[PDB]
């Protein structure tokens, strides 16, 4: 077939990565292993580690936008009451 | 015709082939490179090179002898081959310089030079001998954390901290008399041999070698020392095979001989009776492969070891030879069985009968150490031709269908797909 343009990923055997030497990789068949090894230790401790490291980046913007939405919604519910109709006309024009 | 007699201590085993010339007397111990811990390792190879050193070999060569040694994974041997009229010289040399005092061999000049040469040749073996080192890594990951996992030559990191205290401790703990077998091949008669072992008093020690705590158990594993400097891709996978003195031993050797060994550049090995060579010969998927069947004392391996210059189609070679392995359980014929029967008889005859009387000494010493008496070439041939196709199918369903494999690779092996595909391509869904 037509040999098209080279990319940054080949196939198995010539993957285009750097040449490596001296990196031994030991593994064990799963039939010799126990699956669910340490699911309660890693369910209590490692999940708390990940939640501890990555919750401020999620909860500070969620806190900002939720407080903005709650303040705006309760201001609108204040304005369309009876104690804000002069403020309703003043905000209109 | 292979006679064995137990003396006061030692066991004498001999075979008298009167047409051979060089009679060869030596002692074969039953403590190889799997009877130690991984920290004093290589002390067996160090003992072999101490026995084969310049001092000992000059003393043996001035009298007319030629030393030999062979370290394996449960037996180690020390063989003094000689002329047929001169074997009392062999016996009293092996007495005076190996069995009694070894203070001429074990002082820190000969030991230092021998240790330096052993270090140089072990690192030269580790760098420049690629199929044997991946068979060794296959043994090191198949039986790992268990005493059959050890390198035979020894590793470099556990060889630079060895002194004469290690060698003296090993000679006190494993060079025993309930562990040794003295052998005679060539053309010595049996009774002059034991007459000369019982005239001059020859006994090493009295005790018994320490028994191991952990028996050899297979652990299905994987390893890859991928060095993409190398031009080839040497991988080798193997399952747990049957050990020595097992009833399914000769059917394991026959099932290895079913698939045989191959060499892609010789025009007489490209025409064999293997069904795999119609799959691996249209894109030239490999250069050679050999199906071994090693049987040690406690367990053993069964698999093939290849070399591939076409490093992109490695997984196709693996997949094709594993489908051929599943053909042993499901639909092996009888003409393959009879071809492998005749070829296995030819191979065992080429192994047991040969010109060199030191290989026969090593084989006789091993199979008299483990069994007790040597079974002849006739009884082995009878046990070979008593094998039906259903015995091969039963053994292949026992030890080859969906069993755990262990893989050891080197070279350019990114094209080798990783483990679970190779493990679960040992069992197909019936086509
Ligand atoms: C999306 C997921 C895609 C997954 C592809 C996959 O699993 O292939 C891997 C694997 C690749 O094996 P391989 O490396 O080519 O090995 C070839 C050897 O001859 C060894 O291969 P083999 O002989 O073991 O596999 C041959 C296979 C091939 O089967 C077929 O092609 C027809 C299946 C119908 O025959 C069968 O699967 C017989 C079982 C039929 C299943 C009956 C129950 C389910 C009914 C549907 O193939 C399978 O395991 C077959 C999976 C089932 C077929 C896919 C069905 C998809 C239907 C939609
Ligand atoms: C989940 C509650 C776990 C509370 C923390 C705790 O009790 O300590 C951790 C243990 C360890 O359990 P693991 O997380 O599965 O670790 C396995 C232990 N190895 C095999 C690695 C040695 O966790 C346990 O063994 C708790 C087991 C409770 C099983 C029932 C849960 C409902
Ligand atoms: C234009 C520029 C404007 C800048 C204005 C501020 C912008 C945001 C700056 C970054 C906000 C997040 C900072 C903390 C990051 C974090 O998640 O820390 C989370 C940290 C720990 O984290 P660790 O990784 O050490 O845990 C490693 C655990 N092994 O928990 C705490 O300390 C405790 C809670 C403190 C409150
Ligand atoms: C670029 C991305 C594009 C999309 C890519 C595809 C994404 C696919 C997402 C859908 C998953 C398909 C599952 C196919 C499973 C399979 O086919 O099972 C193939 C495997 C082959 O296993 P094995 O013989 O190798 O080993 C196994 C050990 N010898 O048989 C199995 O284990 C059988 C497991 C049960 C199969 C049924 C599971 C439910 C499937 C139906 C529901 C599917 C939804």
Curated annotation (Swiss-Prot), chain A:
Family, as annotated: Belongs to the UQCRQ/QCR8 family.
Listed GO CC annotations: mitochondrial inner membrane; mitochondrion; respiratory chain complex III
Residue ranges, Mitochondrial intermembrane side: 80-93
Keywords attached to this entry: Electron transport, Membrane, Mitochondrion, Mitochondrion inner membrane, Respiratory chain, Transmembrane, Transmembrane helix, Transport
Name assigned to this protein: Cytochrome b-c1 complex subunit 8, mitochondrial
More details: Present with 6140 molecules/cell in log phase SD medium.
GO MF terms, alphabetically ordered: ubiquinol-cytochrome-c reductase activity
One BP annotation, GO: mitochondrial electron transport, ubiquinol to cytochrome c
Top-level taxon: Eukaryota
UniProtKB/Swiss-Prot annotation, chain B:
Subunit structure: Component of the ubiquinol-cytochrome c oxidoreductase (cytochrome b-c1 complex, complex III, CIII), a multisubunit enzyme composed of 10 subunits. The complex is composed of 3 respiratory subunits cytochrome b (COB), cytochrome c1 (CYT1) and Rieske protein (RIP1), 2 core protein subunits COR1 and QCR2, and 5 low-molecular weight protein subunits QCR6, QCR7, QCR8, QCR9 and QCR10.
Topology of the protein relative to the lipid bilayer: Peripheral membrane protein
Domain of life from the UniProt record: Eukaryota
Subcellular location: Mitochondrion inner membrane
GO biological-process terms attached to the record: aerobic respiration; cellular respiration; mitochondrial electron transport, ubiquinol to cytochrome c; protein processing involved in protein targeting to mitochondrion; proton transmembrane transport
More details: Present with 19300 molecules/cell in log phase SD medium.
Database matches in InterPro entries: Metalloenz_LuxS/M16 (IPR011249), MPP/UQCRC_Complex (IPR050361), Pept_M16_N (IPR011765), Peptidase_M16_C (IPR007863)
Name listed for the protein in its UniProt record: Cytochrome b-c1 complex subunit 1, mitochondrial
Keyword Mitochondrion: yes
One GO CC term on file: mitochondrial inner membrane
Family label: Belongs to the peptidase M16 family. UQCRC1/QCR1 subfamily.
Gene3D superfamilies: Metalloenzyme, LuxS/M16 peptidase-like
Free-text function comment from the UniProt entry: Component of the ubiquinol-cytochrome c oxidoreductase, a multisubunit transmembrane complex that is part of the mitochondrial electron transport chain which drives oxidative phosphorylation.
GO molecular function, one term: metal ion binding
Predominant location category: mitochondrion
Residue ranges crossing the lipid bilayer per the database entry: none
Entry keywords, A to Z: Electron transport, Membrane, Mitochondrion, Mitochondrion inner membrane, Respiratory chain, Transit peptide, Transport
């Amino acid at each position: 077939g037509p040999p098209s343009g080279k990319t940054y990923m080949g196939w198995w055997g010539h993957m285009g990565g750097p040449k490596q030497k001296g990196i031994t990789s030991y593994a064990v068949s799963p039939y010799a292993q126990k699956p669910l090894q340490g699911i309660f230790h890693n369910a209590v401790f490692n999940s708390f580690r990940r939640f501890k490291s990555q919750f401020l980046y999620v909860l500070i913007p969620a806190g900002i936008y939720w407080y903005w939405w709650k303040n705006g919604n309760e201001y609108n519910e204040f304005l369309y009451s009876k104690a804000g109709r002069e403020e309703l006309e003043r905000v209109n024009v | 015709a292979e006679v064995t007699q137990l003396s006061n201590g030692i066991v004498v085993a001999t075979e008298h082939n009167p047409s051979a010339h060089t009679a060869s007397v030596g002692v074969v111990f039953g403590s190889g490179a799997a009877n130690e811990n991984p920290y004093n390792n290589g002390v067996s190879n160090l003992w072999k090179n101490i026995f084969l050193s310049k001092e000992n070999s000059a003393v043996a060569a001035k009298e007319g002898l030629a030393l030999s040694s062979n370290i394996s994974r449960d037996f180690q041997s020390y063989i003094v081959s000689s002329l047929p009229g001169s074997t009392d010289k062999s016996l009293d040399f092996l007495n005076q310089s190996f069995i009694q005092q070894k203070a001429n061999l074990l002082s820190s000049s000969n030991f230092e030079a021998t240790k330096k040469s052993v270090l140089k040749q072990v690192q030269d073996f580790e760098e420049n001998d690629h199929p044997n080192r991946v068979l060794e890594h296959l043994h090191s990951t198949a039986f790992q954390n268990t005493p059959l996992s050890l390198p035979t030559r020894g590793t470099l990191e556990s060889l630079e901290n060895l002194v004469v205290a290690d060698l003296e401790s090993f000679a006190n703990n494993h060079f025993l008399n309930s562990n040794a077998v003295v052998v005679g091949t060539g053309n010595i008669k049996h009774e002059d041999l034991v007459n000369s072992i019982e005239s001059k008093n020859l006994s090493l020690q009295t005790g018994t070698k320490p028994v191991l705590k952990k028996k050899a158990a297979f652990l299905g594993s994987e390893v890859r020392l991928r060095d993409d400097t190398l031009p080839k891709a040497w991988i080798s996978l193997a399952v747990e095979g049957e050990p020595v003195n097992s009833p399914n031993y000769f059917v394991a050797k026959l099932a290895a001989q079913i698939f045989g060994s191959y060499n892609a550049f010789e025009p007489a090995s490209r025409l064999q009776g293997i069904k795999l060579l119609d799959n691996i010969q249209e894109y030239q998927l490999c250069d050679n492969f050999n199906h071994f069947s090693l049987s040690y004392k406690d367990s053993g391996l069964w698999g093939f070891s290849t070399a591939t210059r076409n490093v992109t189609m490695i997984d196709d070679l693996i997949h094709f030879t594993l489908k051929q392995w599943n053909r042993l359980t499901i639909s092996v014929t009888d003409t393959e069985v009879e071809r492998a029967k005749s070829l296995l008889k030819l191979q065992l005859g080429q192994l047991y009968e040969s010109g060199n009387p030191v290989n026969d000494a090593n084989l006789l010493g091993a199979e008299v150490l483990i069994k007790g008496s040597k079974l002849s070439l006739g009884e082995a041939f009878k046990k070979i031709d008593a094998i039906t196709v259903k015995d091969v199918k039963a053994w292949a369903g026992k030890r080859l269908w969906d069993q755990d494999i262990a893989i050891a690779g080197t070279g350019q092996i990114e094209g080798l797909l990783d483990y679970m595909r190779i493990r679960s391509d040992m069992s197909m869904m019936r086509w």
